[PDB]
Design a protein around this ligand. Sequence first.
Ligand SMILES: [Cl-]
Ligand SMILES: [Cl-]
Ligand SMILES: [Cu+2]
Ligand SMILES: [Cu+2]
Ligand SMILES: [Zn+2]
Ligand SMILES: [Zn+2]
Lengths: 153, 153
Amino acid sequence: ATKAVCVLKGDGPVQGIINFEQKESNGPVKVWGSIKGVTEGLHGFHVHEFGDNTAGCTSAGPHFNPLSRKHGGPKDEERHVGDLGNVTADKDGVADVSIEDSVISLSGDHCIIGRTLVVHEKADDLGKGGNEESTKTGNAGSRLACGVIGIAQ
Amino acid sequence: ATKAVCVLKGDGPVQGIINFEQKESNGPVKVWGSIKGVTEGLHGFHVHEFGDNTAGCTSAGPHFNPLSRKHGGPKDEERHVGDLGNVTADKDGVADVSIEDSVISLSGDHCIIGRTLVVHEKADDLGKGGNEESTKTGNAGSRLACGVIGIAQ
Ligand SMILES: [Cl-]
Ligand SMILES: [Cl-]
Ligand SMILES: [Cu+2]
Ligand SMILES: [Cu+2]
Ligand SMILES: [Zn+2]
Ligand SMILES: [Zn+2]
């Protein structure tokens, strides 16, 4: 299988390790791991275009959107390639991440390797929020931690 | 694509930002930037196989070596793809990096996107030391700082 990994860090207490595995060419990508230091509830979770952390998470730019679509949720046909929805933290501030997605890839034009994974302050409204930002960013707010997605063994 | 970036970090603090640019896929990659916090003199400088920083720089594994060749200097035919030689720090502990390399790439099978850039404790002996490690690691010693190479705007 092809594999990738991302270490999430930021300016505050949020940190985690996220794994990716794609067993078959153009097949589903399994995304799993854990994030700690976040508030209980849902937090937006996306791949952003640039693997640039020079000024922290802001340097990663907008959502990864090679097909020029509107923002949505991962279950929607209308979404950015990088739109992985929300992750959910428990009362301890720990989110167990377990996603399977077939729009991201670990090769080709939808490849996410070398791009940035970002966990946000607020929930992503999945494009359902009724204001213009909703179909751009999902209103997920500030970037609490990020990392560059790297090739894994 | 045509640009990449890497934020190097390690204990010291050792800190740097390294940029990569490739005009066309059949051309060389320019590698430039600055590294601070290291001892005066030459330090080994390589792309390692994995973009995995989970336990720091050790997690990046061996030099990026898709052809299974021996370790060398950047000028040599017999080298690893990731063998970028040495960078040189001044009395103030700052290295100004300025390399052009024809073997690394920002696309294709020698693509370094999603891999780890590492600066070392010691100089790289370019495979011309007397010992068996010379033609594996160049005897560059510990890993002072690293980061994952990301796609840049
Ligand atoms: Cl959802
Ligand atoms: Cl040299
Ligand atoms: Cu995001
Ligand atoms: Cu090295
Ligand atoms: Zn989006
Ligand atoms: Zn080498």
